[PDB]
Structure 1
Amino acid sequence: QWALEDFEIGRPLGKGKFGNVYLAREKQSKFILALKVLFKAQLEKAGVEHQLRREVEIQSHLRHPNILRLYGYFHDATRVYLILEYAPLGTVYRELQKLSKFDEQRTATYITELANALSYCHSKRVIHRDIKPENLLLGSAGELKIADFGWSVHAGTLDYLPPEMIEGRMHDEKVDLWSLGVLCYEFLVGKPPFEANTYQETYKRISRVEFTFPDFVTEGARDLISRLLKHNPSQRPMLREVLEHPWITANSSK
């Protein structure tokens, strides 16, 4: 359907091993989007092409206010092009470096928005897995948008991965709830609960669910994060309960 000659490329929005994402405008529509440029070259090299065509599937047949749209794709000789929705306010990663740490009302909100996106996703047996600040964009309304369904799956950094995944075990859609716990702690505190200097120490730390809270993290936050960060998937709340949690509700603007 689409082709490069249909677009006007603007400023780089960022990088990544496989190439860059650019702001871009569809010539005859004047529609603003983001062009994710991926070299076939490198996708083959690091054997991810099977992953890529899965990112396209899942994220394409997905439709949610809190999930970055993928409109389409195309290729030529040197590379593969993803036509992404453009999220005007950058990544939550950047906002977090910017503010270093969020407040309960902002955190609340993101968690909600996030919960909803994952609620919708699981319904379709889609499990994200790779939910980290770097992967969360912001709409003009300032609202969260889960990006990058690269690792995404049906039916590198350890920081966001739950015990089950890391240990090489049975994992379902509970992963995404552990992830939410980690996120939730990172937003309030400014670093993820299992941060360490080595792969090896992080592994232990996650493995044994060793986290502590700074004093300023309030009781309700401790509660929700404590319930989310369970070694055992079965004890992790359902998304519904996260939405229903009283620290969420007390604070979640959106």
Structure 2
Amino acid sequence: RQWALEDFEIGRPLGKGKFGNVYLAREKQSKFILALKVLFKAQLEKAGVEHQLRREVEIQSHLRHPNILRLYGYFHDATRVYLILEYAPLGTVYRELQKLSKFDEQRTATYITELANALSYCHSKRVIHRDIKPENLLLGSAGELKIADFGWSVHAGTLDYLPPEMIEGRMHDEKVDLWSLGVLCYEFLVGKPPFEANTYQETYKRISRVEFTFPDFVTEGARDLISRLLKHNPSQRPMLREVLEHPWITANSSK
């Protein structure tokens, strides 16, 4: 591996905002298709995220579930780092949700199932993702769910997906990704996150006071799982397989 830019032709833009952009792109000589994140070194340490990115490449690259987006290599030049990324043909989950505004229960449970395994794997290797936002949940071609982003940690922007203990600031562990699974689960069937407000200030309270309600079209099966995960006291939360085990899941997923 010694990649310099001229080893690629760049396709259409893929997004995003925060750090620069992510591009469709193609390895000139094997004709390989990939996402090529381009991040200006300019706005990197000019923001202090740099060292908290190295040990997120670290984290990204030696990992390997099929339900986790893979990082191939990297490089840079004058400005900008370049992340050479697996490509997720069917786009993000954020956009599938806007498109269909809600998910059926067969589809949700599958997405949750896939998320557990990828998290359950992440948690054997003791790794904790922090933001499991739908912006970070891409889709493979078989429509497999693939986790993606960059705020991971050791053991032990919107708060919509964070749990109480974080937002205020306490000794946290892998019990965060399980609250995020709850927040997600809800968002999928309802289409909006259970703590949404129009301000960061409401949302903090809605989270602090665990303040959500279910629209009628939501089944006491799912109420039970989401109720269970989104408890305040971290130790209250199912462990990852007690989740997969959940009656409501199993009745509704792939395998």
- Report the TM-score, using the length of structure 2 for normalisation: 0.97
1:77-115, CA deviations, whole angstroms, 9 ceiling, x for partnerless residues?
A: 111000000000000000000011001000000000000
**C-alpha distance 62-147 of structure 1, shift in aligned 2 (>3 A):** same
Whether the 8 Å contact between 1:125 and 1:155 is mirrored in structure 2 is no
Q: Distance in 2 between matches of 1:178 and 1:131?
A: 10
Whether the 8 Å contact between 2:136 and 2:148 is mirrored in structure 1 is yes
Q: Distance in 2 between matches of 1:34 and 1:209?
A: 37
Q: Distance in 1 between matches of 2:184 and 2:36?
A: 27
Task: Provide the aligned C-alpha RMSD in A.
Answer: 1.0
Q: Distance in 1 between matches of 2:18 and 2:242?
A: 38
Whether the 8 Å contact between 1:126 and 1:155 is mirrored in structure 2 is no
Q: Distance in 2 between matches of 1:136 and 1:248?
A: 19
Tell me the SS of whatever aligns to 2:115.
Answer: helix
Whether the 8 Å contact between 1:128 and 1:153 is mirrored in structure 2 is no
**C-alpha distance 101-204 of structure 1, shift in aligned 2 (>3 A):** same
Tell whether 2:225 aligns with 1:224: yes
Cα shift at 1:253:
2.2
Cα shift at 1:154:
4.7
Cα shift at 1:150:
3.6
**C-alpha distance 75-154 of structure 1, shift in aligned 2 (>3 A):** farther
Q: How many residues align?
A: 254
1:36-73, CA deviations, whole angstroms, 9 ceiling, x for partnerless residues?
A: 00000000111100111122000111101000000011
1:157-197, CA deviations, whole angstroms, 9 ceiling, x for partnerless residues?
A: 11000000011111000000000000000000000000001
Q: Distance in 1 between matches of 2:13 and 2:154?
A: 29
Whether the 8 Å contact between 2:130 and 2:151 is mirrored in structure 1 is no
Whether the 8 Å contact between 2:156 and 2:171 is mirrored in structure 1 is no
Residue 152 of structure 1 corresponds to 153
Tell me the SS of whatever aligns to 1:55.
Answer: helix
Please identify, of 13-22 and 76-85, the stretch whose mean Cα deviation from structure 2 is larger. 13-22
In structure 1, list runs of 5 or more residues that go unmatched: none
Whether the 8 Å contact between 2:155 and 2:173 is mirrored in structure 1 is no
Cα shift at 1:152:
4.4
Q: Distance in 1 between matches of 2:154 and 2:36?
A: 23
Whether the 8 Å contact between 1:185 and 1:192 is mirrored in structure 2 is yes
Percent of counterpart pairs with the same letter? 100
Q: Distance in 1 between matches of 2:15 and 2:125?
A: 30
Q: Distance in 1 between matches of 2:184 and 2:207?
A: 14
- Report the TM-score, using the length of structure 1 for normalisation: 0.98
In structure 2, list runs of 5 or more residues that go unmatched: none
**C-alpha distance 7-141 of structure 1, shift in aligned 2 (>3 A):** same
Q: What stretches of structure 1 move > 3 A for 4+ residues in a row?
A: 150-155
Whether the 8 Å contact between 1:39 and 1:79 is mirrored in structure 2 is yes
Whether the 8 Å contact between 1:181 and 1:225 is mirrored in structure 2 is yes
Cα shift at 1:219:
1.0
1:193-245, CA deviations, whole angstroms, 9 ceiling, x for partnerless residues?
A: 00001111110110010110000011110000010001000010011011001
